[model samples]
Target chain A: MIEKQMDRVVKEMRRQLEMIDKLTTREIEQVELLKRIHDKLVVQ
Target chain B: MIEKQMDRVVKEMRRQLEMIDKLTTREIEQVELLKRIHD
Candidate 1:
């Protein structure tokens, strides 16, 4: 039973890792754009 | 049903945001720690 729960954890971790792998790229890009906008606003 | 999943999505985004925040503040510490454990 504990092993099964750990099995689920491993599976879920892989799923999240894949998902994060995709998102972190996009997330970094988003942060870059957001920072640019904020920078422009700050300078204005 | 749609709202249920939307709520879940928002929660997940918040989760990601927190991670992004942590990851942003440092290059080696937060992201590396998480990724090393993942690896």
Candidate 2:
């Protein structure tokens, strides 16, 4: 169960990473901002 | 099923975020490095 769960998450991560691939400079900066907010939300 | 799967991943992410909380300055820097690599 954990194995499949991890596989699913890893698959999602890979998909998102591909979505980030070839992003423009400004787009990458926005991603950085989004990531900061995401990290904050998770910490909260 | 998708909702449960998302819930599972969100829980895991929250756990990892706590793991990163209260990190040292250098540690945060390292996290930034990791994020850059991560991004």
| Clashing residue pairs, backbone N/CA/C < 3 A, model 2 | none
Superposed on the true chain A, the predicted chain A of model 2 yields a TM-score of 0.47
Query: The CA-based lDDT of model 2 is what?
Result: 0.59
Q: Per-residue CA lDDT of candidate 1, range A1-44, in tens?
A: 69999999999889778766665665676577568545544542
Give the runs in model 1 whose Cα sits over 4 Å from its true position. A1-12, B1-39
What is the DockQ score of candidate 2, to 2 decimals? Answer: 0.03
DockQ of structure 1: 0.03
* Residue B16's lDDT in candidate 2: 58
Question: Candidate 2 at residue B34, lDDT?
Answer: 85
**TM-score per candidate, in order?**
0.35, 0.29
lDDT of 1 by residue, B1-39 (tens): 644564467567657766655555555456558877884
Candidate 2: where is the Cα deviation over 4 Å?
A1-44, B25-39
Query: Highest lDDT among the candidates is held by which one?
Result: 1
